[PDB]
Each structure stands twice: as C-alpha cells, then as structure tokens.
Design a protein around this ligand. Structure first.
Ligand SMILES: CCCCC/C=C\C/C=C\CCCCCCCC(=O)O
Lengths: 49, 49
C-alpha cells in the first residue's frame, strides 16, 4: 500500500521529519508514527522555490 | 548580545521558573538539537532538579 507525501519546508527543519521528534513542524504540521515503515527523502531546491 | 569563548566558557544556574519552549518557535531556529537521558516528547510533563 504505497503512498507518497510531498511538501516544502526550510533547511534546518528537515531533522524534525522523524518518528519521535518535537518542534514546530512535528507538533502542528506533520507527524510520523512510532511504528513507521517507509523512507524519507529530501533535497535542496533553492533554484526553483 | 555577546557569547563566551570556548576555552573560557560560561555557566549560569536556572531555578524557580516554568520551562515552556514554545515561545522560541517564532524567533530562533536550531540546526542541532539532541537530548540524551530523556525523550524529546516527554519534556513537557517532567520537572528538573
Ligand atoms: C534557559 C532555560 C532552560 C530551560 C529549562 C531547562 C530545561 C527545560 C527542558 C528542556 C530544554 C528545552 C529545550 C528548548 C529547545 C528546543 C526547542 C524546540 O522544540 O525545537
């Protein structure tokens, strides 16, 4: 059951995309479960955005 | 305004206050934040000595 979720954030908030993290993004915007099975991918897009 | 040098680092005591770090969500962004003997998601329900 494959799903792909996409969005944009700033550079130093990429560390908050993990199962057990706290902060502005992990609290009010996007949270991952503790029993997560998947992969997390990010890359710089300073040219486009 | 000005921080100390690494060889002569500083140290101050914190006591008699309430730890509410949500007030930092609009002023400061941290590239590094790691905790060791506790979980980041449990800091809201504890008391410190
Ligand atoms: C100088 C006051 C010290 C605070 C009182 C001491 C301990 C309180 C408990 C944990 C420290 C809070 C970390 C704040 C930075 C995390 C911000 C974030 O969520 O990204």
């Amino acid at each position: 059951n494959v799903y792909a979720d996409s969005f944009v954030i700033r550079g130093d908030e990429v560390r908050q995309i993990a199962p057990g993290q706290t902060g502005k993004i992990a609290d009010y915007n996007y949270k991952l479960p503790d029993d997560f099975t998947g992969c997390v991918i990010a890359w710089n897009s300073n040219n486009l955005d | 305004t000005r921080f100390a040098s690494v060889y002569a680092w500083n140290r101050k005591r914190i006591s008699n206050c309430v730890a509410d770090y949500s007030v930092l969500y609009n002023s400061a962004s941290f590239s590094t934040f790691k905790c060791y003997g506790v979980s980041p998601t449990k800091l809201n329900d504890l008391c410190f000595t």
